[PDB]
């Protein structure tokens, strides 16, 4: 879970630094949020 969160955060920061479409950036942010929720309470929202 920690590795997933790190990967999503690093990819998001790389995307925002490089310049990406807003829909791609929003998808990456949603993935990062889902990873954080999975790390804290896995399976609380959606499938675990």
């Amino acid at each position: 879970l920690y590795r997933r969160v790190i990967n999503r955060n690093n990819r998001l920061k790389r995307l925002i630094d490089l310049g990406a479409p807003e829909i791609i950036v929003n998808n990456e942010k949603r993935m990062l949020q889902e990873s954080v929720d999975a790390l804290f309470d896995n399976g609380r929202r959606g499938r675990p």
């Binding site: 990406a20 791609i24 990456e28 993935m31």
Partner: protein, 147 residues
Amino acid sequence: EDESEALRQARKDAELTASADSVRAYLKQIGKVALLNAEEEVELAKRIEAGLYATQLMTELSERGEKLPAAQRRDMMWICRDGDRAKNHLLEANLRLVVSLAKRYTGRGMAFLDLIQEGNLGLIRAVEKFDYTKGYKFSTYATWWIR
């Protein structure tokens, strides 16, 4: 039927849906951009070339240049913004090719969404390194970078 407020309200209600699954929501978002063809992609590449040329000229003029008036600067700004917008449009058009290519590597190591985002990164790289002068369809070149 197709008219008289028969299916438009249903389509609007469907578009206003949660779609709690993240991958399903991403597919819904990616489905809102129509595909392109050879003429569209070559025109977009021309816009990219113009925008990059204008940005390079602006960077050159920034130091050891001239005080650009409003008339001479607004054109450069407008063409730069047009080029960036065309690049974004091409990215959103080819995201479908990205996901179609990335569907084949699921089930080992990482997740479907991670593969999709890596595909978008590869597509960005391909768009940066694309060359329309070769007279080639964009998918053939972008497949290598996505992979």
